[PDB]
Amino acid sequence: GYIEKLVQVNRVAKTVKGGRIFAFTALTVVGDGKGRVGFGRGKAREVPAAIQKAMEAARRNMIQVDLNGTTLQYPTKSAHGASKVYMQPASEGTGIIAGGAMRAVLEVAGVQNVLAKCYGSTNPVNVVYATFKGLKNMQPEAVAAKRGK
RNA sequence: AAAGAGUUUGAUCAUGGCUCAGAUUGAACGCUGGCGGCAGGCCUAACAAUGCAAGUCAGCGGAUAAAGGGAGCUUGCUCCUGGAU
């Protein structure tokens, strides 16, 4: 995936006898604009050594998203933890009218007509799982109900 | 014919409040002074100086007593055929 994109970077800490030892955590999304997306988390003592690990772990664990072509397939809802994410299609002139951590995942999947909205928790590491489960769980023609519709 | 940020922790996730960016207004107020068009203008409390509703002459009575036509004096003058308007 080649349109990588960082979302959030957080300075987290740990106490020992001496005091707070620090480490930076970066959450980063990796896509190709065609329906392939992973997300990755990594930690290091320095910022770019953790972004790299977030790039690394997001190039594995990537997923084929069964889109319709530049939009979502149907209006969908998903949730991981207290984070809850509603996503739908838009028509043709709309862009990414979602926002934040959902704006990155629904940019590097190559969708550009979203109209997504998140409720509950806005913590981006769970909003990213909650967008990731909405996208992993669609199907346009792979209904096993043996019909044409 | 539909976007979120900031802030409780040594760090975390959650619950939850606050704060913010936004659009509006019969606006006030702080800073200046170019214009035009179209609008809008006591949201508050009442007491009021001084200047806007009246037309129809088809109803009498007043006024004019036409200029005119005279008359008397003679163009000063009053009554008149009529007496207007």
mmCIF file of C-alpha atoms (C1' of nucleotides) in Angstrom:
data_model
loop_
_atom_site.group_PDB
_atom_site.id
_atom_site.type_symbol
_atom_site.label_atom_id
_atom_site.label_comp_id
_atom_site.label_asym_id
_atom_site.label_seq_id
_atom_site.Cartn_x
_atom_site.Cartn_y
_atom_site.Cartn_z
ATOM 1 C CA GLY A 1 0.000 0.000 0.000
ATOM 2 C CA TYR A 2 1.378 3.318 -1.149
ATOM 3 C CA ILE A 3 -0.771 6.265 0.080
ATOM 4 C CA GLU A 4 0.138 5.779 3.742
ATOM 5 C CA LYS A 5 -1.227 8.312 6.195
ATOM 6 C CA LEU A 6 -0.652 9.019 9.880
ATOM 7 C CA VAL A 7 -3.624 9.746 12.142
ATOM 8 C CA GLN A 8 -2.450 10.170 15.692
ATOM 9 C CA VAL A 9 0.740 10.230 17.689
ATOM 10 C CA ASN A 10 0.653 10.078 21.491
ATOM 11 C CA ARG A 11 3.295 10.566 24.173
ATOM 12 C CA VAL A 12 2.596 7.800 26.684
ATOM 13 C CA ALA A 13 4.590 7.173 29.837
ATOM 14 C CA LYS A 14 5.681 4.607 32.408
ATOM 15 C CA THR A 15 6.976 4.933 35.962
ATOM 16 C CA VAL A 16 10.052 3.116 37.332
ATOM 17 C CA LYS A 17 12.227 3.907 40.402
ATOM 18 C CA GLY A 18 13.860 6.791 38.546
ATOM 19 C CA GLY A 19 10.657 8.260 37.140
ATOM 20 C CA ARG A 20 8.651 8.552 33.945
ATOM 21 C CA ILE A 21 10.238 6.697 31.034
ATOM 22 C CA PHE A 22 8.534 7.850 27.848
ATOM 23 C CA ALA A 23 7.515 6.185 24.613
ATOM 24 C CA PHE A 24 5.619 7.458 21.606
ATOM 25 C CA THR A 25 2.739 5.636 20.014
ATOM 26 C CA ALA A 26 1.656 6.306 16.444
ATOM 27 C CA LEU A 27 -1.532 5.065 14.813
ATOM 28 C CA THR A 28 -1.246 5.019 11.043
ATOM 29 C CA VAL A 29 -3.395 3.861 8.129
ATOM 30 C CA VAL A 30 -2.031 2.380 4.898
ATOM 31 C CA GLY A 31 -3.979 2.006 1.664
ATOM 32 C CA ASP A 32 -3.816 1.980 -2.112
ATOM 33 C CA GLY A 33 -6.911 3.899 -3.184
ATOM 34 C CA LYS A 34 -8.522 0.778 -4.612
ATOM 35 C CA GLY A 35 -10.012 -1.155 -1.719
ATOM 36 C CA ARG A 36 -7.004 -2.343 0.218
ATOM 37 C CA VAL A 37 -6.461 -0.975 3.721
ATOM 38 C CA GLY A 38 -4.633 -1.930 6.854
ATOM 39 C CA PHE A 39 -4.032 0.065 10.000
ATOM 40 C CA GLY A 40 -1.022 -0.223 12.251
ATOM 41 C CA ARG A 41 0.126 0.699 15.723
ATOM 42 C CA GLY A 42 3.733 0.933 16.829
ATOM 43 C CA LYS A 43 5.813 2.184 19.709
ATOM 44 C CA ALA A 44 9.321 3.562 20.100
ATOM 45 C CA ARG A 45 11.183 6.100 22.208
ATOM 46 C CA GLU A 46 11.463 8.530 19.284
ATOM 47 C CA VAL A 47 8.652 9.794 17.029
ATOM 48 C CA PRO A 48 9.825 8.608 13.554
ATOM 49 C CA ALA A 49 11.012 5.230 14.826
ATOM 50 C CA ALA A 50 7.444 4.609 15.994
ATOM 51 C CA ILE A 51 5.780 5.923 12.829
ATOM 52 C CA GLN A 52 7.892 3.470 10.865
ATOM 53 C CA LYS A 53 6.707 0.630 13.066
ATOM 54 C CA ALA A 54 3.180 1.907 12.486
ATOM 55 C CA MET A 55 3.835 1.842 8.752
ATOM 56 C CA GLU A 56 5.323 -1.628 9.016
ATOM 57 C CA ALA A 57 2.488 -3.257 10.924
ATOM 58 C CA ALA A 58 -0.073 -1.605 8.653
ATOM 59 C CA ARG A 59 1.407 -3.073 5.485
ATOM 60 C CA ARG A 60 0.668 -6.480 6.886
ATOM 61 C CA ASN A 61 -2.898 -7.081 8.132
ATOM 62 C CA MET A 62 -4.509 -5.423 5.112
ATOM 63 C CA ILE A 63 -8.013 -6.216 3.881
ATOM 64 C CA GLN A 64 -9.863 -6.309 0.563
ATOM 65 C CA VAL A 65 -12.834 -3.943 0.847
ATOM 66 C CA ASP A 66 -15.749 -4.892 -1.398
ATOM 67 C CA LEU A 67 -16.793 -1.445 -2.568
ATOM 68 C CA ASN A 68 -19.194 -0.290 -5.269
ATOM 69 C CA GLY A 69 -16.773 2.081 -7.027
ATOM 70 C CA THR A 70 -15.893 5.362 -5.231
ATOM 71 C CA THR A 71 -18.793 4.991 -2.728
ATOM 72 C CA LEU A 72 -19.768 2.565 -0.012
ATOM 73 C CA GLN A 73 -21.983 -0.355 -0.917
ATOM 74 C CA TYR A 74 -24.872 0.225 1.518
ATOM 75 C CA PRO A 75 -25.470 2.358 4.630
ATOM 76 C CA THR A 76 -23.727 0.535 7.408
ATOM 77 C CA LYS A 77 -23.073 0.688 11.121
ATOM 78 C CA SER A 78 -20.227 -0.734 13.159
ATOM 79 C CA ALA A 79 -18.726 -0.525 16.585
ATOM 80 C CA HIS A 80 -15.722 -1.655 18.582
ATOM 81 C CA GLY A 81 -15.816 -0.905 22.290
ATOM 82 C CA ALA A 82 -17.684 2.281 23.127
ATOM 83 C CA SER A 83 -16.932 3.706 19.674
ATOM 84 C CA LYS A 84 -19.798 3.534 17.188
ATOM 85 C CA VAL A 85 -19.552 4.381 13.501
ATOM 86 C CA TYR A 86 -22.275 4.986 10.935
ATOM 87 C CA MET A 87 -21.270 5.107 7.266
ATOM 88 C CA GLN A 88 -23.350 5.351 4.125
ATOM 89 C CA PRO A 89 -23.084 6.073 0.381
ATOM 90 C CA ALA A 90 -23.160 9.517 -1.165
ATOM 91 C CA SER A 91 -24.096 10.431 -4.727
ATOM 92 C CA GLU A 92 -21.257 11.774 -6.839
ATOM 93 C CA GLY A 93 -20.196 15.312 -5.981
ATOM 94 C CA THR A 94 -19.810 14.785 -2.222
ATOM 95 C CA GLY A 95 -16.415 14.035 -0.767
ATOM 96 C CA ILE A 96 -15.339 12.713 2.542
ATOM 97 C CA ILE A 97 -17.855 14.361 4.822
ATOM 98 C CA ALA A 98 -16.883 12.141 7.726
ATOM 99 C CA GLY A 99 -13.942 13.356 9.693
ATOM 100 C CA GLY A 100 -10.939 12.642 11.816
ATOM 101 C CA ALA A 101 -9.851 9.041 12.152
ATOM 102 C CA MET A 102 -12.651 7.934 9.837
ATOM 103 C CA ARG A 103 -11.409 10.387 7.247
ATOM 104 C CA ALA A 104 -8.099 8.614 6.827
ATOM 105 C CA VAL A 105 -9.422 5.052 6.603
ATOM 106 C CA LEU A 106 -12.117 6.241 4.212
ATOM 107 C CA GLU A 107 -9.542 7.978 2.040
ATOM 108 C CA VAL A 108 -6.995 5.229 1.556
ATOM 109 C CA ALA A 109 -9.663 2.695 0.680
ATOM 110 C CA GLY A 110 -10.301 4.829 -2.362
ATOM 111 C CA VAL A 111 -13.809 5.775 -1.417
ATOM 112 C CA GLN A 112 -14.636 9.411 -1.942
ATOM 113 C CA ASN A 113 -18.391 9.597 -1.309
ATOM 114 C CA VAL A 114 -18.892 8.650 2.311
ATOM 115 C CA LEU A 115 -20.983 10.761 4.631
ATOM 116 C CA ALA A 116 -19.851 8.947 7.779
ATOM 117 C CA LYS A 117 -20.473 9.900 11.396
ATOM 118 C CA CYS A 118 -19.119 8.515 14.660
ATOM 119 C CA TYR A 119 -20.904 8.409 18.006
ATOM 120 C CA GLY A 120 -19.960 7.242 21.448
ATOM 121 C CA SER A 121 -16.211 7.407 21.797
ATOM 122 C CA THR A 122 -14.043 9.560 19.586
ATOM 123 C CA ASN A 123 -10.757 7.933 20.673
ATOM 124 C CA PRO A 124 -9.152 7.272 17.300
ATOM 125 C CA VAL A 125 -7.702 3.827 17.978
ATOM 126 C CA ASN A 126 -11.211 2.393 18.442
ATOM 127 C CA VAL A 127 -12.793 4.587 15.799
ATOM 128 C CA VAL A 128 -10.235 3.052 13.443
ATOM 129 C CA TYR A 129 -11.271 -0.501 14.421
ATOM 130 C CA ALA A 130 -14.903 0.521 14.082
ATOM 131 C CA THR A 131 -14.402 1.839 10.579
ATOM 132 C CA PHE A 132 -12.295 -1.193 9.771
ATOM 133 C CA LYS A 133 -15.059 -3.601 10.705
ATOM 134 C CA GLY A 134 -17.656 -1.755 8.670
ATOM 135 C CA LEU A 135 -15.458 -2.007 5.606
ATOM 136 C CA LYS A 136 -14.420 -5.632 6.120
ATOM 137 C CA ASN A 137 -18.050 -6.745 6.347
ATOM 138 C CA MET A 138 -19.641 -5.668 3.071
ATOM 139 C CA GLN A 139 -20.537 -7.621 -0.044
ATOM 140 C CA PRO A 140 -22.287 -6.422 -3.243
ATOM 141 C CA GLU A 141 -22.871 -9.642 -5.175
ATOM 142 C CA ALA A 142 -21.482 -12.218 -2.757
ATOM 143 C CA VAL A 143 -24.880 -12.860 -1.271
ATOM 144 C CA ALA A 144 -25.109 -16.638 -1.128
ATOM 145 C CA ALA A 145 -28.886 -16.426 -1.527
ATOM 146 C CA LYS A 146 -28.969 -17.952 -4.971
ATOM 147 C CA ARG A 147 -30.544 -15.091 -6.902
ATOM 148 C CA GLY A 148 -29.617 -12.214 -9.185
ATOM 149 C CA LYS A 149 -31.034 -9.726 -6.653
ATOM 150 C "C1'" A B 1 -39.966 22.867 -11.821
ATOM 151 C "C1'" A B 2 -24.672 15.073 8.507
ATOM 152 C "C1'" A B 3 -16.570 16.281 9.968
ATOM 153 C "C1'" G B 4 -14.630 17.609 15.265
ATOM 154 C "C1'" A B 5 -10.940 19.740 18.667
ATOM 155 C "C1'" G B 6 -9.175 21.145 24.149
ATOM 156 C "C1'" U B 7 -9.261 19.867 29.183
ATOM 157 C "C1'" U B 8 -9.618 14.653 35.167
ATOM 158 C "C1'" U B 9 -4.192 10.608 34.622
ATOM 159 C "C1'" G B 10 2.529 9.296 35.911
ATOM 160 C "C1'" A B 11 0.314 6.992 31.443
ATOM 161 C "C1'" U B 12 -4.525 4.194 29.845
ATOM 162 C "C1'" C B 13 -9.495 3.086 28.422
ATOM 163 C "C1'" A B 14 -14.451 4.300 29.689
ATOM 164 C "C1'" U B 15 -18.297 7.409 31.816
ATOM 165 C "C1'" G B 16 -19.340 12.197 32.014
ATOM 166 C "C1'" G B 17 -19.381 17.704 32.315
ATOM 167 C "C1'" C B 18 -17.324 22.300 30.888
ATOM 168 C "C1'" U B 19 -14.549 25.339 26.917
ATOM 169 C "C1'" C B 20 -14.081 26.195 21.352
ATOM 170 C "C1'" A B 21 -14.273 26.622 15.994
ATOM 171 C "C1'" G B 22 -19.960 27.465 13.101
ATOM 172 C "C1'" A B 23 -24.257 29.808 11.302
ATOM 173 C "C1'" U B 24 -27.667 33.871 12.624
ATOM 174 C "C1'" U B 25 -29.727 39.228 14.913
ATOM 175 C "C1'" G B 26 -34.846 45.015 14.932
ATOM 176 C "C1'" A B 27 -28.602 44.375 17.895
ATOM 177 C "C1'" A B 28 -25.405 47.418 21.377
ATOM 178 C "C1'" C B 29 -20.556 49.144 22.254
ATOM 179 C "C1'" G B 30 -15.170 49.967 20.893
ATOM 180 C "C1'" C B 31 -12.176 51.896 17.004
ATOM 181 C "C1'" U B 32 -12.940 55.831 10.044
ATOM 182 C "C1'" G B 33 -14.905 58.757 7.892
ATOM 183 C "C1'" G B 34 -15.626 56.891 -0.108
ATOM 184 C "C1'" C B 35 -20.001 55.690 -2.942
ATOM 185 C "C1'" G B 36 -24.531 53.720 -4.898
ATOM 186 C "C1'" G B 37 -28.970 50.746 -4.921
ATOM 187 C "C1'" C B 38 -32.875 48.098 -2.160
ATOM 188 C "C1'" A B 39 -34.383 47.573 2.587
ATOM 189 C "C1'" G B 40 -34.796 48.083 7.946
ATOM 190 C "C1'" G B 41 -35.013 51.425 12.452
ATOM 191 C "C1'" C B 42 -38.310 52.528 20.719
ATOM 192 C "C1'" C B 43 -37.020 45.119 21.702
ATOM 193 C "C1'" U B 44 -37.130 49.302 27.349
ATOM 194 C "C1'" A B 45 -42.220 52.567 30.346
ATOM 195 C "C1'" A B 46 -44.804 55.411 30.853
ATOM 196 C "C1'" C B 47 -46.509 61.532 30.798
ATOM 197 C "C1'" A B 48 -47.145 64.867 26.792
ATOM 198 C "C1'" A B 49 -45.879 71.120 24.349
ATOM 199 C "C1'" U B 50 -47.104 72.388 19.082
ATOM 200 C "C1'" G B 51 -48.664 71.350 13.732
ATOM 201 C "C1'" C B 52 -53.564 65.153 10.001
ATOM 202 C "C1'" A B 53 -61.357 62.979 8.364
ATOM 203 C "C1'" A B 54 -65.061 66.149 5.330
ATOM 204 C "C1'" G B 55 -67.100 66.407 1.617
ATOM 205 C "C1'" U B 56 -72.095 67.425 -1.092
ATOM 206 C "C1'" C B 57 -75.616 74.229 -3.037
ATOM 207 C "C1'" A B 58 -79.363 68.967 -5.321
ATOM 208 C "C1'" G B 59 -82.535 72.787 1.898
ATOM 209 C "C1'" C B 60 -83.497 77.602 3.834
ATOM 210 C "C1'" G B 61 -81.469 82.065 5.089
ATOM 211 C "C1'" G B 62 -77.541 85.497 4.462
ATOM 212 C "C1'" A B 63 -73.958 88.031 0.730
ATOM 213 C "C1'" U B 64 -73.963 90.258 -4.339
ATOM 214 C "C1'" A B 65 -77.609 94.258 -4.735
ATOM 215 C "C1'" A B 66 -73.102 91.816 -11.904
ATOM 216 C "C1'" A B 67 -69.840 94.214 -15.624
ATOM 217 C "C1'" G B 68 -74.726 94.394 -18.589
ATOM 218 C "C1'" G B 69 -79.932 97.330 -19.536
ATOM 219 C "C1'" G B 70 -81.399 101.927 -17.605
ATOM 220 C "C1'" A B 71 -83.001 106.031 -14.520
ATOM 221 C "C1'" G B 72 -81.952 110.453 -11.050
ATOM 222 C "C1'" C B 73 -77.511 113.532 -10.200
ATOM 223 C "C1'" U B 74 -73.804 113.065 -14.517
ATOM 224 C "C1'" U B 75 -69.682 109.371 -14.980
ATOM 225 C "C1'" G B 76 -68.817 110.872 -7.885
ATOM 226 C "C1'" C B 77 -73.703 108.505 -6.938
ATOM 227 C "C1'" U B 78 -78.149 105.174 -4.979
ATOM 228 C "C1'" C B 79 -82.827 102.368 -6.763
ATOM 229 C "C1'" C B 80 -83.314 99.169 -10.729
ATOM 230 C "C1'" U B 81 -85.562 95.179 -16.621
ATOM 231 C "C1'" G B 82 -83.070 92.224 -13.927
ATOM 232 C "C1'" G B 83 -80.367 91.439 -9.921
ATOM 233 C "C1'" A B 84 -75.574 87.932 -11.526
ATOM 234 C "C1'" U B 85 -71.861 85.093 -10.030
#
